[PDB]
Amino acid sequence: GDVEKGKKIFVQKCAQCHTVEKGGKHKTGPNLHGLFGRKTGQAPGFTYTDANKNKGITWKEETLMEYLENPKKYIPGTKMIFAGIKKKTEREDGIAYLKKATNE
Numbered sequence: 134g135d136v137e138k139g140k141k142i143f144v145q146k147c148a149q150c151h152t153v154e155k156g157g158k159h160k161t162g163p164n165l166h167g168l169f170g171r172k173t174g175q176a177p178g179f180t181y182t183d184a185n186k187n188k189g190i191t192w193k194e195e196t197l198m199e200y201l202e203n204p205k206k207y208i209p210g211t212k213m214i215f216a217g218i219k220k221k222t223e224r225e226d227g228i229a230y231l232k233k234a235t236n237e
C-alpha cells in the first residue's frame with residue numbers, strides 16, 4: 134500500500150461527496166481536514182450535517198474500524214450514496230494514507 138495509490142482510490146472512492154481541492158464547492162461531508170484533530174465535522178465554511186452541527190466525535194483510526202459496522206448507527210439521518218470501493222483491504226489502505234494526511 135502506497136500513498137500515491139491511496140490518493141487515487143479516494144478520488145473514485147467518493148471524492149465527489151467530499152469535494153475536490155479547496156476552491157470548488159462544499160462537499161456533503163468533511164473531506165478529511167481535522168478528521169483526527171477537530172471535534173466532529175465542525176469544518177469552517179463547510180455545511181455540516183445535523184450530526185456534525187451537534188458535534189458528534191473525532192473520527193479516529195481505531196474508532197473508524199468499529200464505526201465501519203453501522204454507518205447509520207454512528208450518525209443517524211445521514212445516508213452514504215455512491216462508493217466504487219468496498220474491499221476491506223482497499224478501505225483500510227486508504228485510511229493509512231489518511232493517517233499521514235492528517236499527520237505526516
Ligand code: HEC
Pocket residue numbers: 146147150151160161162163164165166167168173174175182184185192208211212213214215216218224
Ligand atoms: C456521498 C453520498 C458520500 C460518499 C460516497 C462518502 N461520503 Fe463521507 N460523508 C458524506 C456526507 C454527506 C457526510 C456527512 C455525515 C455522514 O456521516 O455522512 C459524510 C461523513 C463523512 C465524514 C465526516 C468527517 C468529519 O470531518 O466529520 C468522513 C470523514 C467520511 N464521511 C468519510 C468517507 C470516506 C472515507 C468515504 C469513502 C471511502 C466516504 N465518506 C464516502 C458523503 C459521502
